[PDB]
Amino acid sequence: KFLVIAGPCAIESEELLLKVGEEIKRLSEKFKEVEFVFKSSFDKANRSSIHSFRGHGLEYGVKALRKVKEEFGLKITTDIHESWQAEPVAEVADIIQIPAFLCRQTDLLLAAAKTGRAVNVKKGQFLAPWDTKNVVEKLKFGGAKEIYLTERGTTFGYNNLVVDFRSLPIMKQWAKVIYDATHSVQLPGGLGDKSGGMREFIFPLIRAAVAVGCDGVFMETHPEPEKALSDASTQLPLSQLEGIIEAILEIREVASKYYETI
Amino acid sequence: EKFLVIAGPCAIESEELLLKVGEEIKRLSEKFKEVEFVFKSSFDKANRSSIHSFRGHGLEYGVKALRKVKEEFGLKITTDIHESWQAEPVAEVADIIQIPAFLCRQTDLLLAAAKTGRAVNVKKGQFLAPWDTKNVVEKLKFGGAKEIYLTERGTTFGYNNLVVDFRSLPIMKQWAKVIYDATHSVQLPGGLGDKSGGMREFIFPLIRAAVAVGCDGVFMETHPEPEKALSDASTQLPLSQLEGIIEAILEIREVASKYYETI
Amino acid sequence: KFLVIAGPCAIESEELLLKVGEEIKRLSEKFKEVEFVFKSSFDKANRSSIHSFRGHGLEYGVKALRKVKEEFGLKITTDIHESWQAEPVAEVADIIQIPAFLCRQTDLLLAAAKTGRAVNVKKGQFLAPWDTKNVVEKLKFGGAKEIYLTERGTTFGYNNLVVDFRSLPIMKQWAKVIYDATHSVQLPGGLGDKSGGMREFIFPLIRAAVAVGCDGVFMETHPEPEKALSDASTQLPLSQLEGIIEAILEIREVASKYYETI
Amino acid sequence: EKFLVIAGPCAIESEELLLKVGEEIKRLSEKFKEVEFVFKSSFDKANRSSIHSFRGHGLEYGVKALRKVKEEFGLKITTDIHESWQAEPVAEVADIIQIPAFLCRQTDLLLAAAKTGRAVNVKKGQFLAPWDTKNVVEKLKFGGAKEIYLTERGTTFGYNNLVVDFRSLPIMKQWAKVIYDATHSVQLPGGLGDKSGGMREFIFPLIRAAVAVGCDGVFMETHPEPEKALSDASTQLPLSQLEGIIEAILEIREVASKYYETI
């Protein structure tokens, strides 16, 4: 069924995770035809500035994520940054996420595939849609069986990303496709010390994604984005999540009749 | 508001071709009463890549052919102009005067179109940013235009390729009605060397995206037999497929409409 | 010999043209191994804003340009915007310039070629280097014998241009190549009502052009760019023209040994 | 200041290959005394497009091979790291630790390199704007790096293509020494499908542009027989052509140097 990956960008505290997890659990009960996966990074290993928030470490993160899965019975997903992290993360993560900048790092992909867990690779901003075929092949070689590719924008001049929706049907040829609705509108290094983005385009573009056809969507959501320690300009207010989900489900219901085969 | 569907053969290959397509558009106009159809065809392809490619049979012949379509089917008409002097004779038949993408910044062409009193539709240049169109609309208003459209037809993305940045739709809506060009947006500029190429398999998915995001109309080139077209043979939609596409976009528009943001 | 096309962007007044023409005449006498061509537009037909400076009309412009050619004996070049302008402009213009946005307008190219004059086409920001082969063919079909292609940057994301220097050797296969040193650093619509640009990159990039190899350079020059009615952010101060010319001639002298054949 | 020339075979195909190339680099180092040569070769291509492409013979073998080059020829050494743990063993032989382009934002990798006390050269990501490198240098300085280089190797321009924006050289010079990668800048990412392509005919002209604009050094992959290389077979410079290229860039650098702007 349709996948909805959502949660706060970074694990600012297990408290934050629980509050968001409580809402995702509620929507999970309201939208039975949707498979929700809770997401949150234990480390922002690629911040632009050395002085920006990274996190509380892998152990605290994996612990907080365990709390969410045990308390709400929600599937989990988080990203890894170096090969050694795959094993400990797989203890809780149902889906191991591979960062966009690291989508070509062979050992990271193999490490993730070896855990036996599902793997979701963020398509690098430097990659062409057809270049992802090789990515999937590495994962299959590594033993991965459940593989996802996430569209999160492509480099378009400086400090800007564009979403080429032709990528959805192209990547669908070799993997399930997820559309990252929040990172696709961010402006890389847009604010000098941090990245920017236009929240006003999150909804319009997610509607486009389901109209074109995808297997799921990815959304960063925070109770108060303004106070977020990461992606404060792009995380979706928690309260607006329900409305957006219902909206894309309705559009998908009507549009699905026209999704092209393979 | 009434959704606009601008459709027709890319170029006026013959008056016979126009009537053939016009007959089908008229039929669909009777079925899709909630749609405002505008028949489109260029009397001249003034910017072909090669000197050896088809251009047309001249303005006189073209306007005459377009007038036959309006007279026989009662359909609104739109065609593009390339130089200022063409605005006047074209306004005689064209309900909407179209400004080519490469010429979207040519002040005199825009002014010539605006003073005719007809509606003006400007194809957004492949070199233009969405917010850059505000000044285009300003020039038109200055010139007397009261009904203005801006058409999204892709942006230069590396060589011989265009990308559609859908953020352009809500941005341009701030100052004009917005049209999505479903066929030119998938063309590969100069892709075939002496001519441009294209990927027809992406026409439908991208048009679904356009209506889900929200626009005021769509623009589609359509030909009975695309493979035999004298221009854009790789991107024109087979006429037989037009009905189905229109029905689909009306359905997606309806379900997504309650979510369209207010500008 | 090496071509240097220079002059004020727009014909703000025949007075401005004479002052600039006087300096270009002086450099012409100092650099005998260089063929100088005086340039200035009688009309800026593609300004972003309807309220920006366009010019004083074709007649006044052609007249002022005649004054420059007669008073200083300098070759002339100006751009045309519609087919009817080719004939009257050819009365004075040694080289007819075709605007970047209009490089694909067949009738404009043919009109220019019919005059018997040399034709310099600005490569559209939307054109690939190899797409210019067709441009030259149209001109040859139209009777043109002296044909130039000018590199002036390519669309790179929004409101920015990048100079792909690979274009120089590619275009050289079918025409003489000119590098536009001033427009290549302009930021299209950068200031909302007008375009922007970084003057600091004019010199570095022109050095690159001659190191790679070209048949000439194009430079907008004004006594006081700050007061210019067009491209105030990119026109080169008249006083700096001599130094730049000597510099590129020196670099060309050494680098020419390595220019690849054809 | 002494111009830097970083050169060597893309990958450590064998210790024999390294000595062969090292011998030539040593010879040129004796002729071009005004140049500081640094021998380069990767012990691992950790980011090949295909799982079936050559990667290397491991870190242990590679460091040993590089040490043989330094020992036998007295040349400085540089190689790239892919994960934090590799910094320490690599620092034992590498005078300059290289950070791959895709990993230019990985904080721990940069920190691991900085604390070794060795010089660090970061390949500018194809996704990074020139001014975005200021923060890269800041992280390195924070981590203890005292000798920092930023390498221009092209920027994503549409699909499977890179463009070199030479404005990056003077911009990056504001906070670090700048190196121009003459061979990777002409490669076509994923161009050959299972591997990347490239246009060797543009290597020389673009390197001439780099020195005319002004940089602190150049980076060139060089192999005795490029067509037989196990990586970048389409872009590595034939070893026989290295001498001529170096002489040419030194000549162009000399004549253009009086015009280099002050940062």
Ligand SMILES: O=P(O)(O)OC[C@@H](O)[C@@H](O)[C@H](O)CO
């Ligand atoms: O704000 P900066 O530090 O640029 O980081 C961008 C974040 O969006 C980043 O860590 C993201 O999740 C990774 O690409």
Ligand SMILES: O=P(O)(O)OC[C@@H](O)[C@@H](O)[C@H](O)CO
């Ligand atoms: O096939 P070529 O001649 O490149 O022309 C492309 C057509 O698509 C052309 O007339 C177009 O819509 C105009 O820009």
Ligand SMILES: O=P(O)(O)OC[C@@H](O)[C@@H](O)[C@H](O)CO
């Ligand atoms: O400043 P704006 O009006 O954008 O004009 C850009 C000028 O550089 C322009 O007329 C140029 O000479 C044409 O492209």
Ligand SMILES: O=P(O)(O)OC[C@@H](O)[C@@H](O)[C@H](O)CO
């Ligand atoms: O040929 P493929 O595997 O695409 O690899 C490209 C090489 O050019 C590669 O290892 C490169 O410099 C790394 O990014």
